[PDB]
Amino acid sequence: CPLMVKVLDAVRGSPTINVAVHVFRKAADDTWEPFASGKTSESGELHGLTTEEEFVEGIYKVEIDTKSYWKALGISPFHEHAEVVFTANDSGPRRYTIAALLSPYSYSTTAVVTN
Amino acid sequence: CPLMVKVLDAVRGSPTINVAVHVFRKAADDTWEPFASGKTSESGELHGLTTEEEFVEGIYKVEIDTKSYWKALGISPFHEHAEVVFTANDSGPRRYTIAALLSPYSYSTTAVVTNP
Amino acid sequence: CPLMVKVLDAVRGSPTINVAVHVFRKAADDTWEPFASGKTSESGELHGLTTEEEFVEGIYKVEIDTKSYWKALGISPFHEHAEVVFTANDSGPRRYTIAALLSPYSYSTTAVVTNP
Amino acid sequence: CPLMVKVLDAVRGSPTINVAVHVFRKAADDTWEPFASGKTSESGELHGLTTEEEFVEGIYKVEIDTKSYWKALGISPFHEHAEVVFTANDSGPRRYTIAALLSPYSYSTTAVVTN
Ligand SMILES: O=C(O)C1(c2ccc(-c3ccc(Cl)c(Cl)c3)c(F)c2)CC1
Ligand SMILES: O=C(O)C1(c2ccc(-c3ccc(Cl)c(Cl)c3)c(F)c2)CC1
């Protein structure tokens, strides 16, 4: 599993459950081509987005649909989504975890990159 | 000054100086149209981006050129840039500060929305 | 003004107003001695805590009374308070801003150390 | 495992390995009594600090020795440590994960509290 996303809720002190995540890859014409999508589980994790064969070098965008998450809890948040844009696999295959912590008017994101 | 950006460096504990910031507005066709841009000052702030008359309700994207900032420091960064996408509304408190705290593999951002 | 504190609310997107902040200095016996205190202003800032003559090198603790802030908003918080413990040195850039961003179950803090 | 600590490094994009963690519990005289301690593993996690029987109600302080971590990597950081102080188990036993993200001049911490 070369690309995983884990999301926490800073208001309730819990995993962020059932947040939609869309991954895009920049094409030659510089548009964002849809690459993979899914929803976080009860543990706040999203596994199984892609495979090592499919996850080639490129510039990827991970979009976390935070507005839908807050609106479904009856909260009006500030951001449309949380986005993370990065070059991947440019020195060979790596494994990426995108971690995020969400508040209605704020988010933090970090990356854990292994072997 | 309805929209301001402030950027901090979590590695050096300093304002983020001379970093390019681009603001875009989402058009009817759903593309991002350039709206305003600048470079942060010695205090890490970018003022005077827009005016009240120009800053109408809609969806805006603030892009911070973090990759060039880290590279100028000889530091290898993770992100291509930091992006903040939000709706401006008139029922809200008028003045928007977008704040960001930068590390090579992480960033945090918050909005401070205040005042009459 | 060698030491300043600024506090932001990540739930409401606003400065954290009227929150108690206590500063302590570590004594020779290793206890924490009261040093300075105040409440944040309408802009979430606390200025005038100390002076250059009083703010000597040593270990300091800044305690932000976050629990009372959230309770006043009717919100159940996790932390008893937020604490920031650091050494002040004279080889460093003189002015210290302690910044904190608050959520009910989380806080982030950074230091901005600048200027002659 | 009712109390766990997980720490990430925002500079290197990796788990924070071998950071010391000390837990204290406030005594009746309001002093901080040592309660448990350990070091994070290669995954950045610290398990096995306490048991459900020992982890009674009280005010606990989790101190993450971030200065020793940065100094061992040849970096001079700002903070002495990162501290998290909270009341635990006041509505019955819960499981607590204290998560932290570290930079030389900054840290963030969040809590995940379950059942
Ligand atoms: O004038 C402001 O808004 C300042 C400020 C800017 C940013 C923050 C800040 C603090 C913590 C985080 Cl995680 C983030 Cl994203 C931003 C902060 F606490 C203060 C003090 C410089
Ligand atoms: O298994 C993980 O990776 C977990 C985790 C997820 C997120 C973080 C985290 C903690 C703080 C910040 Cl600011 C950010 Cl962006 C992420 C954290 F410290 C830990 C513990 C749930």
Side-chain angles (χ1 to χ4, degrees):
Chain A
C1 197
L3 179 62
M4 316 185 308
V5 179
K6 184 194 250 270
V7 190
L8 300 177
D9 181 325
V11 171
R12 313 216 270 97
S14 62
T16 298
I17 304 171
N18 200 38
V19 67
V21 180
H22 296 252
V23 186
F24 306 85
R25 177 182 188 271
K26 203 139 106 199
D29 49 37
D30 262 40
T31 65
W32 288 110
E33 166 91 11
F35 180 80
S37 69
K39 264 156 154 66
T40 59
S41 67
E42 54 263 54
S43 68
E45 302 179 346
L46 171 49
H47 302 261
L49 279 168
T50 190
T51 64
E52 179 176 307
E53 267 190 20
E54 165 179 79
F55 191 38
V56 296
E57 192 278 337
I59 300 174
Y60 291 81
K61 167 162 65 177
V62 173
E63 214 162 65
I64 303 174
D65 295 329
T66 60
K67 185 170 179 192
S68 301
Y69 172 78
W70 293 117
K71 267 180 151 54
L73 299 173
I75 296 175
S76 201
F78 182 78
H79 301 95
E80 290 297 301
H81 47 241
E83 306 196 10
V84 176
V85 182
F86 60 102
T87 299
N89 307 306
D90 210 1
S91 304
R94 300 290 189 272
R95 302 226 295 258
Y96 298 85
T97 297
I98 305 302
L101 178 61
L102 308 184
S103 297
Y105 279 71
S106 186
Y107 64 88
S108 302
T109 187
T110 194
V112 180
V113 183
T114 61
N115 82 13
Chain B
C1 202
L3 175 62
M4 191 218 94
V5 181
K6 185 163 188 140
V7 190
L8 297 181
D9 179 327
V11 171
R12 315 200 287 161
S14 67
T16 305
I17 297 163
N18 195 40
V19 179
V21 177
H22 289 74
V23 186
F24 305 88
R25 183 173 193 283
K26 196 184 243 194
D29 55 74
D30 270 33
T31 60
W32 291 109
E33 309 284 88
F35 181 78
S37 62
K39 296 187 136 220
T40 57
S41 70
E42 291 282 355
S43 66
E45 296 180 356
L46 180 49
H47 301 263
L49 279 167
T50 189
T51 67
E52 287 187 320
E53 233 172 19
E54 304 176 307
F55 193 52
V56 300
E57 288 188 306
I59 303 180
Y60 291 85
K61 168 164 71 174
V62 175
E63 208 161 87
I64 303 169
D65 178 14
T66 61
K67 186 180 189 180
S68 307
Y69 174 73
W70 293 116
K71 283 207 268 197
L73 295 178
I75 296 173
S76 178
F78 178 74
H79 303 93
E80 286 297 296
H81 40 71
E83 291 193 346
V84 180
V85 180
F86 64 98
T87 298
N89 40 83
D90 282 343
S91 65
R94 292 74 154 305
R95 301 190 195 266
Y96 293 78
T97 296
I98 303 296
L101 175 62
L102 304 184
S103 292
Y105 282 80
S106 175
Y107 71 87
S108 299
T109 189
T110 193
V112 192
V113 186
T114 61
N115 210 64
Chain C
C1 202
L3 175 62
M4 191 218 94
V5 181
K6 185 163 188 140
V7 190
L8 297 181
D9 179 327
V11 171
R12 315 200 287 161
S14 67
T16 305
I17 297 163
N18 195 40
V19 179
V21 177
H22 289 74
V23 186
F24 305 88
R25 183 173 193 283
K26 196 184 243 194
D29 55 74
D30 270 33
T31 60
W32 291 109
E33 309 284 88
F35 181 78
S37 62
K39 296 187 136 220
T40 57
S41 70
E42 291 282 355
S43 66
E45 296 180 356
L46 180 49
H47 301 263
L49 279 167
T50 189
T51 67
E52 287 187 320
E53 233 172 19
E54 304 176 307
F55 193 52
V56 300
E57 288 188 306
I59 303 180
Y60 291 85
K61 168 164 71 174
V62 175
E63 208 161 87
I64 303 169
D65 178 14
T66 61
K67 186 180 189 180
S68 307
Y69 174 73
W70 293 116
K71 283 207 268 197
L73 295 178
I75 296 173
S76 178
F78 178 74
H79 303 93
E80 286 297 296
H81 40 71
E83 291 193 346
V84 180
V85 180
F86 64 98
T87 298
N89 40 83
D90 282 343
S91 65
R94 292 74 154 305
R95 301 190 195 266
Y96 293 78
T97 296
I98 303 296
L101 175 62
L102 304 184
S103 292
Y105 282 80
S106 175
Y107 71 87
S108 299
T109 189
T110 193
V112 192
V113 186
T114 61
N115 210 64
Chain D
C1 197
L3 179 62
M4 316 185 308
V5 179
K6 184 194 250 270
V7 190
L8 300 177
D9 181 325
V11 171
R12 313 216 270 97
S14 62
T16 298
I17 304 171
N18 200 38
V19 67
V21 180
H22 296 252
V23 186
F24 306 85
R25 177 182 188 271
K26 203 139 106 199
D29 49 37
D30 262 40
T31 65
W32 288 110
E33 166 91 11
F35 180 80
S37 69
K39 264 156 154 66
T40 59
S41 67
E42 54 263 54
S43 68
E45 302 179 346
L46 171 49
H47 302 261
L49 279 168
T50 190
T51 64
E52 179 176 307
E53 267 190 20
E54 165 179 79
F55 191 38
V56 296
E57 192 278 337
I59 300 174
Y60 291 81
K61 167 162 65 177
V62 173
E63 214 162 65
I64 303 174
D65 295 329
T66 60
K67 185 170 179 192
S68 301
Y69 172 78
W70 293 117
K71 267 180 151 54
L73 299 173
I75 296 175
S76 201
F78 182 78
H79 301 95
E80 290 297 301
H81 47 241
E83 306 196 10
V84 176
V85 182
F86 60 102
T87 299
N89 307 306
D90 210 1
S91 304
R94 300 290 189 272
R95 302 226 295 258
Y96 298 85
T97 297
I98 305 302
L101 178 61
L102 308 184
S103 297
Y105 279 71
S106 186
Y107 64 88
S108 302
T109 187
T110 194
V112 180
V113 183
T114 61
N115 82 13

